Every structure is written in C-alpha cells, then in structure tokens.
C-alpha cells in the first residue's frame, strides 16, 4: 500500500471449536544481510572437519527461511494442556502464512558509531518452495523457528543445504541450487505476502497410553482352548508332556500379536555416583552404515525408555534430549538438559535397553542340549503392532518423507506426522543495494554494497482437527497439571530478568484407551 | 543428488542434544552437547537406510589370492523346505 | 457500588492497551537463536479522544425557599480558581462534589 500504513494486524490467539482447534502465533522477526549477498561453496575442509564420518560438500546461501516446526510456535501451555488433556488425538488439517509491516534498515558507520536509517526504496524478496525443487532442511531439529514466546524477537536462519561428498570433495552427480533462480515476490515497506497451505491426509497422533499391556489381553478367569509343552524329561527318557495354558501361567498362552521391532541402545544411568569402564559415548553407541559413513542411532525406532521402576535408566541416543533455558553448547551436565522419556509405549514396544527376545539356534537331542540367542535386533514381522514416538511441546510437528521407491511406515523417528508434500520452505532474502559504483565502466560484478537488513512481523494459522475421547472408564484418569506449591517463578513464564523458560518437556499421553 | 544423512542444514545447529563424554578423565560423569555441523554422524534423523542380507565381497583386480573356493560355500543364500537356495540378486543394496 | 464512590459494573469500559512495535537493531551477519536484545530508541505520540453519552434525572421539587449552589467567590484573589498560574500550571482548588440540591426522603 504505502509507507504510512500497516500492511497487517497483530493475530495471536488459539480458537477452540467442537472437533477443531485454530492456532494463531505472530512474532516479529530480524533478517540481515548473509554472505555478503554471495553464495559460498562449503565442505569439512572449510570448516577444519578431519573425521570422515562427518565430512560433507554442500553450499551457503544469502538466503533466509522461515520455520514453525515446532509445537510450542503455535500452542501456549495451556492450550497445550488442554489439548492433551481433553483429546485422544490430532492432526493438522490446513495452514495460513502472512508477512506484513516489511521495514527494512540501512546502517552506516563513521568512526565507531553505527547509524540507522529507513530505506524506504529497497525491497526484500520472499518466495515458497511449493515443488519442492530444492533441498528440504525443515526436517531436521534445526534451531531458529520461532520464539514459544510471543513477544520475543527473533533472528531468521541462514539457508543452507548439503549435497554428494566424497570426503571434502565433490562429485559430478553433486547438485549447485541458484535460489536467485525461482520466481519470488519482491516487497517494499508498503507491501505484504501471504499464502495458504492444505495438509495432506495423515493419522492422528496417538495422544493416548495404553491402559493393557499386549501380553494381558486374555480373559484372566477362562482357560485357554490349546496346549503347551509343559515337561521334556520325566525326571535321560523323552517324555513329552503337555497342560492347558491358563490364568495360572499367561507367559506360554498363545497370542495373536507380537511386540513391534526394536534396535537395541546402551544402557545408561542418571543416577550420580556411579563408575564407567570406559568412554563408550560413541564407541558403545548404536549406528548405521551409509556408503562408509557410520551415522548415530538417533533417535532410531520408538521403544520403550525404560523398564518399570528404571526411570533412572535412558537409552544412549534413542530418546530426545532438550536443553533448559541458558543451558551451553558443549559439554553440559545432566541437570542442564532435558531428557525424554516413552515409557508410556512399554505396553507394545520393547524396551530400548533389552534384548526382542530369544531364539532357538539348534537341534536339541540327546547329545546336545536346547541352545538359545539373545535377539539384539528384531526386524518388522507379521502381526506386530507398535505406538509411534510420542511428540513434544518444544518438539518438531513435521518432516518431508524422503522422494524413494519404497518406505516403511513413514512416520517421522524424531516424533510427529510424516508426509510427501509438507508445508513448502518459505525463503527471504534482502535484495542487495549496490553502493556507488564507477564513473568508468567495469565487467567485474560488484563487491561493495549498502549495509542493509529488514524487519516485520510473520504470522502463521494452522487448524487442527481433534479426535475426542470416548473412554468408559470409571475411574478419574492421569492429567497434566501444574504444582500449586509455592515456587520463585511461575513455570512456563518469565523470570525477573524478562527470560522466558520451559522448565520441562510435556508429552501427549496423558489419557488412556484399551489396547 | 543427496544422501540419508546429509539432508540437515549446514549452517544451524540441532535444539537437541546428544551424549557427547562419559567419563571425567572410573567415576561417571555425563556430559551433552548441542549437535550441530561440526558432527553431523550425531544429529538426530527421522529416517534411516533401508534393509540388508550382506554378501560376500569378490574383486574383480587381476593378480589376487583367495583362500579357498568360496564360490558357494561363502554365499548368502536362503532355505526353504531343506533345499539352499542362492540369494541372487537379494535385496537392493548399494554394490 | 464501588467503596471510593462512583458506579459498579460488571462489564465496564474495557482496558485499552497500547504498546510501540519493538524495532530491532541492526542483526548479526551469522544466526544466533537468542531473542534479540539490540532495538531501535523509540517512543510514540499521538492525539486521544473519548466521547460518553450522560443521562440526566432533572430535578421536580416544590421546595420554596432557594436551593444551596456551588458558586465561585468574588472576592478578590491573585489566581482565578480553576484556572492556570503565572507559569501556566494548571490546578484543582478544592474537591466538589454533587449533592448541592435537596429532596424528601
């Protein structure tokens, strides 16, 4: 429109209808200049990388990127309660994404002192990614989305992406992406953007635990119409005898469904003062192996944290660790970090830290006694059934599902809804405002620039579809619920200092359902 | 034009953190650091390589030594009713 | 009714709030994820106008002799009451309330 008038309105509110809710999050957000307007190749050589499990090749671009990946961009504690409160489950159904109030800054310096001015002239350039025709990094647990607290401002990320190394080299099928490339909308101080969304069809997420575990499903008053081998030896005769499988002895009665894969992780222990034989952070860790390249289990396959009673015990990389507010970078201690946990899934996933289950592994006789093998991993078997990882307040909503031939259960590992077409990347960018060039002509392109960098407000809608509870159960079931002891700070809210915190992880699965 | 797991943002570090040391230098003392570009081998993933039945490695370089005759008794193969049958091709798997 | 005088509700004129859009300063060229501490010194001004309708009770008495008024004093004064100073301060005298006139009970 133009200068003097705002090009949107301040949207931040959470709607609750019957089946649906509509989140409305707005943060103000800051977007300088990145590279110096120049695209960068990068690599571990660059960067000083030695270890080839690490080595890679990819590119830096000036280009920013918006991202709300993550729950708590869009619901507050409490709306967050309520939902898991008072709901079976949920999806996203459809999204709505608006940048207004565009105003973009021009810093000069004389000596020492830095002077900021409006550019009223100047543009930023914002386009969606909606064929998907470059890398998709939105589905990685990257930092920079925006703030759980609405009135925090935050910085844009740079864009950057990854393509085919060999070491810190390159090879002929490795891709070169020119953002400058796509058509993109270019906005001045007086203009807005925006664009809709639909999500495409995917499951609820179970925001439920199990109130029956797989192995109690039978009826504990009525035997079981088939028998098992209950004795081999009479007292070195063969006598084969055999018993009814019943209340008495649920272990060896026969079963419809089995517990779902797993992918064993070390064992590790919270409690402190406690002795280790040796640094197996890495060594001791599970991984897999891609074109030589060992990568970190991490989170892997959802299975239990823990054992009942061991919730001292966490797998080594197969649970989410978040980090409290203020907490570093390196080498934290524990009470620095958040760690998750999925015991609620112990009713049909096996446990991280222990073995599927035993196989035999030969043929019994006279001379040889009945062997058997610890099963470390146990691939996906007919009849199995198994609960997806549980997702988080602070945690990711939802990942691009790699373009491949086949997949199974395309389920995000680090927890939320996995899908072919996700919201598209929204990429911004301050266009460059060349400084004054030569009176004479020169073909070199030019290297020396306004110092620029832009400001607004963005707002994103999501509606959510609920799936409601309909349990029979007569007793009152497990809540989330604040501490009404007194306490310095109100959890979930700022300090004296103005620092917003969330002082720990909120799952989902609080209500429970039969199995 | 890209591999599992190279797909992260080069550029940003990880909201997640990961087991980095366990012991101080026996006592056990853990320690987690943010996982970010410098270790990518360590960030978390949603999604992982696709299954595996490995096959004995043959090259194809002139002037070689084998230790045996390892044509059939070093293959993959699968039973079926008592009889061995050869994997052959098996599953995808990068040669 | 509200203890200090004046009229009770349950839904009364609602708060109005306002506050200056934080402006942030020039950001650094590589991403950082805290929240932004460098912003531009601002502040807002503006004109303010509110407009309420009142409903008078006019008042029936039959009452023969004249009514107590509030009146200002003739009597000679430095200041007009009510009114601004030689430094253009503007001041309230006294309190005045609203219970001049008289009825039955």
Same mark, same amino acid.
């Given at each position: 429109?133009?200068?003097?008038?705002?090009?949107?309105?301040?949207?931040?509110?959470?709607?609750?209808?019957?089946?649906?809710?509509?989140?409305?999050?707005?943060?103000?957000?800051?977007?300088?200049?990145?590279?110096?307007?120049?695209?960068?190749?990068?690599?571990?050589?660059?960067?000083?990388?030695?270890?080839?499990?690490?080595?890679?090749?990819?590119?830096?671009?000036?280009?920013?990127?918006?991202?709300?990946?993550?729950?708590?961009?869009?619901?507050?504690?409490?709306?967050?309660?309520?939902?898991?409160?008072?709901?079976?489950?949920?999806?996203?159904?459809?999204?709505?994404?608006?940048?207004?109030?565009?105003?973009?800054?021009? =810093?000069?310096?004389?000596?020492?002192?830095?002077?900021?001015?409006?550019?009223?002239?100047?543009?930023?350039?914002?386009?969606?990614?909606?064929?998907?025709?470059?890398?998709?990094?939105?589905?990685?647990?990257?930092?920079?989305?925006?703030?759980?607290?609405?009135?925090? =401002?935050?910085?844009?990320?740079?864009?950057?992406?990854?393509?085919?190394?060999?070491?810190?080299?390159? =090879?002929?099928?490795?891709?070169?992406?020119?953002?400058?490339?796509?058509?993109?909308?270019?906005?001045?101080?007086?203009?807005?953007?925006?664009?809709?969304?639909?999500?495409?069809?995917?499951?609820?997420?179970?925001?439920?635990?199990?109130?029956?575990?797989?192995?109690?499903?039978?009826?504990?008053?009525?035997?079981?119409?088939?028998?098992?081998?209950?004795?081999?030896?009479?007292?070195?005769?063969?006598?084969?005898?055999?018993?009814?499988?019943?209340?008495?002895?649920?272990?060896?009665?026969?079963?419809?469904?089995?517990?779902?894969?797993?992918?064993?992780?070390?064992?590790?222990?919270?409690?402190?003062?406690?002795?280790?034989?040796?640094?197996?952070?890495?060594?001791?860790?599970?991984?897999?192996?891609?074109?030589?390249?060992?990568?970190?289990?991490?989170?892997?396959?959802?299975?239990?944290?823990?054992?009942?009673?061991?919730?001292?015990?966490?797998?080594?990389?197969?649970?989410?660790?978040?980090?409290?507010?203020?907490?570093?970078?390196?080498? =934290?201690?524990?009470?620095?970090?958040? !760690?998750?946990?999925?015991?609620?899934?112990?009713?049909?996933?096996?446990?991280?830290?222990?073995?599927?289950?035993?196989?035999?592994?030969?043929?019994?006789?006279?001379?040889?006694?009945?062997?058997?093998?610890?099963?470390?991993?146990?691939?996906?078997?007919?009849?199995?059934?198994?609960?997806?990882?549980?997702?988080?307040?602070?945690?990711?909503?939802?990942?691009?599902?790699?373009?491949?031939?086949?997949?199974?259960?395309?389920?995000?590992?680090?927890?939320?809804?996995?899908?072919?077409?996700?919201?598209?990347?929204?990429? !911004?960018?301050?266009?460059?405002?060349?400084?004054?060039?030569?009176?004479?002509?020169?073909?070199?392109?030019?290297?020396?620039? !306004?110092?620029?960098?832009?400001?607004?407000?963005?707002?994103?809608?999501?509606?959510?579809?609920?799936?409601?509870?309909?349990?029979?159960?007569?007793?009152?079931?497990?809540?989330?619920?604040?501490?009404?002891?007194?306490?310095?700070?109100?959890?979930?809210?700022?300090?004296?200092?103005?620092?917003?915190?969330?002082?720990?992880?909120?799952?989902?699965?609080?209500?429970?359902?039969?199995?």
């Amino acid at each position: 429109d133009g200068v003097g008038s705002s090009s949107g309105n301040w949207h931040c509110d959470s709607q609750w209808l019957g089946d649906r809710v509509i989140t409305t999050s707005t943060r103000t957000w800051a977007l300088p200049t990145y590279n110096n307007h120049l695209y960068k190749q990068i690599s571990n050589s660059t960067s000083g990388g030695s270890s080839n499990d690490n080595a890679y090749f990819g590119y830096s671009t000036p280009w920013g990127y918006f991202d709300f990946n993550r729950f708590h961009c869009h619901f507050s504690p409490r709306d967050w309660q309520r939902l898991i409160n008072n709901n079976w489950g949920f999806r996203p159904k459809r999204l709505n994404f608006k940048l207004f109030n565009i105003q973009v800054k021009e =810093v000069t310096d004389n000596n020492g002192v830095k002077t900021i001015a409006n550019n009223l002239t100047s543009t930023v350039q914002v386009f969606t990614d909606s064929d998907y025709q470059l890398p998709y990094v939105l589905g990685s647990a990257h930092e920079g989305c925006l703030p759980p607290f609405p009135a925090d =401002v935050f910085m844009i990320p740079q864009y950057g992406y990854l393509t085919l190394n060999d070491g810190s080299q390159a =090879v002929g099928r490795s891709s070169f992406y020119c953002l400058e490339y796509f058509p993109s909308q270019m906005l001045r101080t007086g203009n807005n953007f925006q664009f809709s969304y639909e999500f495409e069809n995917v499951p609820f997420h179970s925001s439920y635990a199990h109130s029956q575990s797989l192995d109690r499903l039978m009826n504990p008053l009525i035997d079981q119409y088939l028998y098992y081998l209950s004795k081999t030896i009479n007292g070195n005769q063969q006598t084969l005898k055999f018993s009814v499988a019943g209340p008495s002895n649920m272990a060896v009665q026969g079963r419809n469904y089995i517990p779902g894969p797993s992918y064993r992780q070390q064992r590790v222990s919270t409690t402190v003062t406690q002795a280790a034989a040796s640094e197996f952070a890495w060594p001791g860790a599970s991984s897999w192996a891609l074109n030589g390249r060992n990568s970190l289990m991490n989170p892997g396959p959802a299975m239990a944290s823990h054992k009942e009673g061991e919730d001292r015990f966490f797998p080594l990389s197969g649970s989410l660790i978040f980090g409290k507010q203020g907490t570093g970078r390196d080498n =934290v201690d524990a009470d620095k970090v958040m !760690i998750t946990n999925e015991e609620e899934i112990k009713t049909t996933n096996p446990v991280a830290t222990e073995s599927y289950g035993q196989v035999a592994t030969n043929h019994q006789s006279a001379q040889a006694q009945a062997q058997t093998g610890w099963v470390q991993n146990q691939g996906i078997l007919p009849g199995m059934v198994w609960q997806d990882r549980d997702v988080y307040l602070q945690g990711p909503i939802w990942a691009k599902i790699p373009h491949t031939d086949g997949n199974f259960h395309p389920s995000p590992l680090m927890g939320g809804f996995g899908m072919k077409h996700p919201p598209p990347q929204i990429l !911004i960018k301050n266009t460059p405002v060349p400084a004054d060039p030569p009176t004479a002509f020169n073909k070199d392109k030019l290297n020396s620039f !306004i110092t620029q960098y832009s400001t607004g407000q963005v707002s994103v809608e999501i509606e959510w579809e609920l799936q409601k509870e309909n349990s029979k159960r007569w007793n009152p079931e497990i809540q989330y619920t604040s501490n009404y002891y007194k306490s310095n700070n109100v959890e979930f809210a700022v300090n004296t200092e103005g620092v917003y915190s969330e002082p720990r992880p909120i799952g989902t699965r609080y209500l429970t359902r039969n199995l």
